[PDB]
Amino acid sequence: PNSLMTNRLVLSGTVCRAPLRKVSPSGIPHCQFVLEHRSVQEEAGFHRQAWCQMPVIVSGHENQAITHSITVGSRITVQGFISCHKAKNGLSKMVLHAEQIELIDSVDKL
Amino acid sequence: GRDPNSLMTNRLVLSGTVCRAPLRKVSPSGIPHCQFVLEHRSVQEEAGFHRQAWCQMPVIVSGHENQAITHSITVGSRITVQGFISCHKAKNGLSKMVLHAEQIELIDSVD
């Protein structure tokens, strides 16, 4: 079955929305923020500008550990899987479920 | 000064079923475009719990260089697309996320 399950997104950007923590009805912690991405990517041999404000979410207690040093303005690289909602629109509600976060301006040391 | 290269990262690989038959056209400036929607479904885990990751991802294959790898695709086709995402408010809605394909793989090619 897992042949058609590939789902992985790696995206760098600047946190433009301060990381807000919410707790699910069951008491599960979550961290939400928006990542502003701006770059130039390779397309058919040419250079194409790519822009996106990607909402991100870090779900789970232990996963919260990777969001303790981020704030508005932080430049990072999020890796995880995407999920969407119908949103009554042609793909409107997209979200990156973060599994790993890297602070590009740091050396792993908090 | 320019941003560091480390801030440029944008790479997505997604597998799925083409639910929207590919539509092709050539822009007034001579650029060929092929567009379709890829419906993705996968099982994921978070906080030790299970859930399905689902999405109907708009895909576009722009440029002459990568047009060939598309004419063998229709609805029901299981494929894997890799590229970068862009969500410009261009056509309509800043929430219009599009996957610019640079590579596509046929998971079942028999016709």
Experimental method reported for this structure: X-ray
Total domain count, chain A: 1
Q: Which two tokens stand for residue A7?
A: 């789902």
Contacts of A45 (CB under 8 A, 6+ apart): B63, B65
Task: Say whether B94 and A53 touch across the interface (CB within 8 A).
Answer: yes
Residue numbers in A near B14 (CB within 8 A): 6-8, 82
SS3 B36: strand
DSSP at B27: -
Cβ-proximal residues to B2 (8 Å cutoff; 6+ apart), any chain: none
Do residues A16 and A36 lie in contact, with contact meaning Cβ atoms separated by under 8 Å? yes
* B111: its two tokens: 């016709």
Facing A81 at nearest CB: one of B10, B53, B56: B53
In chain A, beta strands by DSSP E: 7-23, 29-43, 46-59, 75-85, 93-103
> B111: domain CATH number?
2.40.50.140
- Resolution of the experimental model, in Å, one decimal: 2.1
Task: Please tell me which of the candidates B13, B66, B87 has its beta carbon nearest to residue A6.
Answer: B13
Q: Residue B7: which of A83, A93, A104 has the nearest Cβ? A: A104
Helix (H, G, I), strand (E, B) or coil at A61: coil
Interface contact B9-A5, CB threshold 8 A: no
Closest C-alpha to A36, from A19, A21, A51: A51
Instruction: Report the DSSP beta bridge partners of residue A101.
Output: A78
From A57, A60, A65, select the one nearest A98 (Cα to Cα): A57
| B96 DSSP assignment | -
**Closest C-alpha among A45, A55, A49 to residue A78:** A55
Domain that holds residue A101: 1-110
Nearest CA in chain A to B57: A91
Residue type, A98: A
Question: What distance in Å separates the CA atoms of residue B94 and residue B26, rounded to the nearest whole number?
Answer: 24
Sign, CA dihedral A77-A46-B25-B65, equals negative
Collect all residues with Cβ–Cβ distance below 8 Å to B27 and sequence separation of at least 6.
Answer: B33
User: What single-letter amino acid sits at A38?
Assistant: R
